[PDB]
Design a protein around this ligand. Structure first.
Ligand code: MG
Ligand code: MG
Ligand code: MG
Ligand code: MG
Ligand code: MG
Ligand code: MG
Ligand code: MG
Ligand code: MG
Ligand code: MG
Ligand code: MG
Ligand code: MG
Ligand code: MG
Ligand code: MG
Ligand code: MG
Ligand code: ZN
Lengths: 25, 118, 155, 60, 206, 91
RNA sequence: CAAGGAGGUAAAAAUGAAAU
RNA sequence: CGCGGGGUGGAGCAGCCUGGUAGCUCGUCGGGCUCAUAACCCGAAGGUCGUCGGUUCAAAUCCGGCCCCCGCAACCA
RNA sequence: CCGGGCACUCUAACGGGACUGCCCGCGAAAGCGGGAGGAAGGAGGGGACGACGUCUGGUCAGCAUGGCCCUUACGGCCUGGGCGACACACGUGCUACAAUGCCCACUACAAAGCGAUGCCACCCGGCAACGGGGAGCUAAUCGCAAAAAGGUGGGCCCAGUUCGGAUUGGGGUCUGCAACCCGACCCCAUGAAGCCGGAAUCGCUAGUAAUCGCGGAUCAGCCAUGCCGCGGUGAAUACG
């Protein structure tokens, strides 16, 4: 889901981080 | 079980079955069953009636959902009725609200192509 | 204008088997260049062959390929704006390629759920002479059969 | 608007975001490298001249 | 056509730089602008010398500047002017060690910039261009050259029709790296427009 | 009557009298032509010798072309007493 | 081992472009 | 003025008699092929059925009144 | 991490290294085929390099420049608007239509580059964007970064459904004098079209196509799915 802003995969693609993709640990 | 305005989802995980309500989505889903204290991976098939009652009582209250909040959302757009702003006119003409590109695309609000030709 | 006859590409033999054929099959399974997932699926299906039949997958796979081999195929050729279809023989290289290709394709044509069980079953069906690939093989030979008229155009 | 426009590019007052880059050799406002203070056009000219210290053709 | 600048094409091996100094960021930009304004200021009141090069070297407030000239006639003995405030007027926006040297380019007929500049003067003298090209080439070839090539392009002898006059004797291999090929260029300003003169001078290498 | 422009310079010369879109020496020339194309009730009126009128061929079919000066053309579509898509271009 | 003299001959595919 | 036939998308024709479906070629509009046009290929849109009334649950269709079009007839003195 | 050492790896500076030189066969020669020779070969694989000329090709809006025109103005400054408009048409693309798939958690393996008028470790508040602190780094020292596909475990079970993410409502953050026209993210809720594409049409012959992420330029920010680079896994086929 490279364009969904609610996945670790979409957050990768977008670049930014967040709740669905925390800044590690 | 007729939780809010709906009842449909049977044998398909309560954290997922919950999603089938305008107002629940995915975040409020697990948030509701951790706050009610119910196992997410359950059958949804009318399990313990007590868990279902607590779930219903919490969910249906707390926050607005289903036909009621659809009315509120529609009313928030009705806000820009009167002598409203620019954003209202975009809801009037049927065009994209956030000022995007309308030269091409914007089919999700304009609808299918009409073709003028000339 | 093919000055060079384009030498035949050679592969690396697999693990546990040493096949000069199985790896070619794993390659066709491979999508997006993930040989890991590809090889796994085949070896998975090899484990699946052991269940439904007490046969070693090295023969089940081998015989399946042998049953999905086009003896002769139809070839569209010359004179009349390329109007004819001469039925030509098939080179051992091409029988090789078609066998594995039709296998994987027919395998993913099956209504099953897991890629491994599709591969395993399609191989078992093909080993018997029943697979959807065998259909494809027998079909291509029908076309080649019906064109024996101007087959003497040959080449 | 070109002469009075290379004036503003060096004048740079009134709000910090109204200030912008601008090739010095030319007056180009686009493709201006911060490193040289030059547009991509001028930079290529001088690089072939040899007037750019260390700057050399890239082959690899 | 489309051909790369035979100077830039070398730069590394064969034909070194023309401004040899090292700096990191926050400095390169300022020192390059100053460097170019030196080249700009020199070219003006030193054209009568006809300068083949303007080498520049630096070492923290040191700024050395070497001016190559066919005939350094405009230097005239120490306090005979043409150097004093002239090499001192540089430090009116610099204030650093304005060390200005003067070189004697021996044969101007083997210096590409000088050749092209002599030709571009002749265009403005209203000379017959094709004959001017021929002579300049032979003149370069007369002074021991291994190969030469001069090119004037556009608006030749006035007349509404852009042309391109071409002449080249001996050997001029532009593609080769071990070339030692000197390249010069000049703008001829005319009452009917502007035309460009290319000059290629070649010597052996290995 | 001229009804639509494709060339902005042409548009400005006829509407506001803005001459900065055309050559300076072709101002009077272009003007007399445009007025002729404006007054023309039929393509037959745009037929004076000094215009070298003719319809274009190929993909430009349906268009016409009177001559301003040298290799320069004013092209348009004339229909029912009106010209449309007034363009200024090379031949 | 080297050729001259003899014969069946492509197809379905039309136009031209805007000052010398 | 007497009999007979006919008015249907832009063009030319069906469908009416056995009321509930308006169809065909060409043209038009979109997109391809070509440097481009034509040809060709793909895909679309388009009709108060001349008009005014009547019968019917329902009229292009069945029945009348006009309005044009076409074809016959208009003979014996 | 220290003592110590620098043979390995790496770093970057000059070199050695194949020229079908050696063997068989073919030939008049050039050369071609084949073979041990070694990392390598019969231009090893890629770059930079673009002949005389052609297109009255492209560029007076990079710049220069002949001519023509404008000068209380075709110049100059400002605030605001516009380049972002939308009944439509074409190009180049990005994300998909799912199960060799998607989601969550854990756990590995790169290269090439950028940063002390910045990159910002580690804590603290915060669901998060981010904010408070605050160490090291003029940087093969410190930081940007954990690479991602992969692997292990677990959950969905093939339904427009945990596929897909458009669109829209609400709440927020950060840059900026200011983000309504027209900024990027974050969070809640909506969750559209699409179930794989008509006539047609494109790319690629070996690290290559496909797939995966990473960097940089411009840059206060950013409409970047772009462009220029980097490496990860890694096909198919060439009769003719
Ligand atoms: Mg917009
Ligand atoms: Mg800039
Ligand atoms: Mg004709
Ligand atoms: Mg002709
Ligand atoms: Mg058409
Ligand atoms: Mg056509
Ligand atoms: Mg009678
Ligand atoms: Mg070469
Ligand atoms: Mg031209
Ligand atoms: Mg200019
Ligand atoms: Mg634009
Ligand atoms: Mg649908
Ligand atoms: Mg499905
Ligand atoms: Mg190739
Ligand atoms: Zn510039």
């Amino acid at each position: 889901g490279k364009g969904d802003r609610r996945t670790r995969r979409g957050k990768i693609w977008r670049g930014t981080y967040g709740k669905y993709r925390p800044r590690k640990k | 079980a007729r939780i809010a305005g709906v009842e449909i989802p049977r044998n398909k995980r309560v954290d997922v079955a919950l999603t089938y309500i305008y107002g629940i989505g995915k975040a409020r889903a697990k948030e509701a069953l951790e706050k009610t204290g119910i196992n997410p991976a359950t059958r949804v098939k009318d399990l313990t009636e007590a868990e279902v009652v607590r779930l219903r009582e919490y969910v249906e209250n707390t926050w607005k959902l289903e036909g009621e909040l659809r009315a509120e959302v529609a009313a928030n757009i009705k806000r820009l009725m009167d002598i409203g702003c620019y954003r209202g006119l975009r809801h009037r003409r049927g065009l994209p609200v956030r000022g995007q590109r309308t030269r091409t695309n914007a089919r999700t609000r304009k609808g299918p192509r009409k073709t003028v030709a000339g | 204008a093919r000055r060079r006859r384009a030498e035949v590409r050679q592969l690396q033999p697999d693990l546990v088997y040493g096949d000069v054929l199985v790896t070619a099959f794993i390659n066709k399974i491979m999508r997006d260049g993930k040989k890991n997932l590809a090889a796994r699926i085949f070896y998975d299906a090899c484990k699946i062959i052991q269940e439904k039949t007490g046969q070693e997958p090295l023969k089940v796979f081998k015989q399946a390929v042998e049953n999905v081999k086009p003896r002769m195929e139809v070839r569209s050729r010359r004179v009349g704006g390329a109007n004819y279809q001469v039925p030509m023989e098939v080179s051992p290289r091409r029988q090789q390629s078609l066998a594995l290709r039709w296998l994987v394709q027919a395998a993913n044509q099956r209504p099953e759920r897991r890629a491994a069980v599709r591969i395993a079953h399609e191989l078992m069906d093909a080993a018997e002479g029943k697979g959807g690939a065998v259909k494809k093989k027998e079909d291509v030979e029908r076309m080649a059969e019906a064109n024996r008229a101007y087959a003497h155009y040959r080449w | 608007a070109r002469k009075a426009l290379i004036e503003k590019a060096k004048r740079t007052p009134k709000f910090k975001v109204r200030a912008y880059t601008r090739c010095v050799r030319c007056g180009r406002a686009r493709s201006v490298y911060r490193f040289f203070g030059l547009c991509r056009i001028c930079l290529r000219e001088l690089a072939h001249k040899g007037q750019l210290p260390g700057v050399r053709k890239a082959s690899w | 056509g489309n051909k790369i600048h035979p100077i830039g094409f070398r730069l590394g091996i064969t034909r070194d730089w023309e401004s040899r100094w090292y700096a990191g960021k926050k400095q390169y930009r300022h020192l390059l602008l100053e460097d170019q304004r030196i080249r700009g200021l020199l070219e003006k009141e030193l054209y009568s010398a006809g300068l083949a090069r303007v080498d520049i070297e630096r070492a923290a407030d040191n700024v050395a500047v070497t001016v190559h000239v066919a005939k350094p006639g405009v230097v005239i003995g120490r306090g005979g002017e043409r150097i004093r405030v002239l090499r001192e007027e540089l430090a009116k926006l610099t204030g650093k060690n304005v060390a200005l040297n003067v070189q004697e380019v021996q044969n101007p007929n083997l210096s590409a910039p000088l050749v092209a500049q002599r030709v571009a003067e002749q265009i403005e003298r209203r000379f017959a261009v094709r004959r001017a090209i021929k002579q300049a080439v032979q003149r370069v070839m007369e002074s021991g050259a291994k190969g030469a090539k001069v090119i004037v392009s556009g608006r030749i002898g006035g007349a509404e029709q852009a042309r391109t006059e071409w002449a080249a004797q001996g050997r001029v291999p532009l593609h080769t790296l071990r070339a030692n090929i000197d390249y010069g260029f000049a703008l001829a300003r005319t009452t009917y427009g502007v035309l460009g003169v290319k000059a290629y001078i070649f010597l052996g290498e290995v | 009557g001229i009804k639509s422009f494709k060339h902005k310079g042409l548009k400005l010369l006829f509407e506001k009298g803005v001459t900065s879109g055309v050559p300076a020496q072709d101002v009077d020339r272009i003007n007399d032509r445009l007025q002729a194309i404006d007054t023309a009730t039929e393509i037959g009126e745009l037929n004076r010798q000094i215009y070298k009128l003719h319809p274009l061929k190929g993909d430009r079919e349906g268009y016409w072309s009177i001559t301003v000066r040298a290799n320069w053309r004013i092209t348009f579509q004339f229909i029912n007493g009106d010209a449309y898509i007034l363009n200024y271009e090379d031949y």
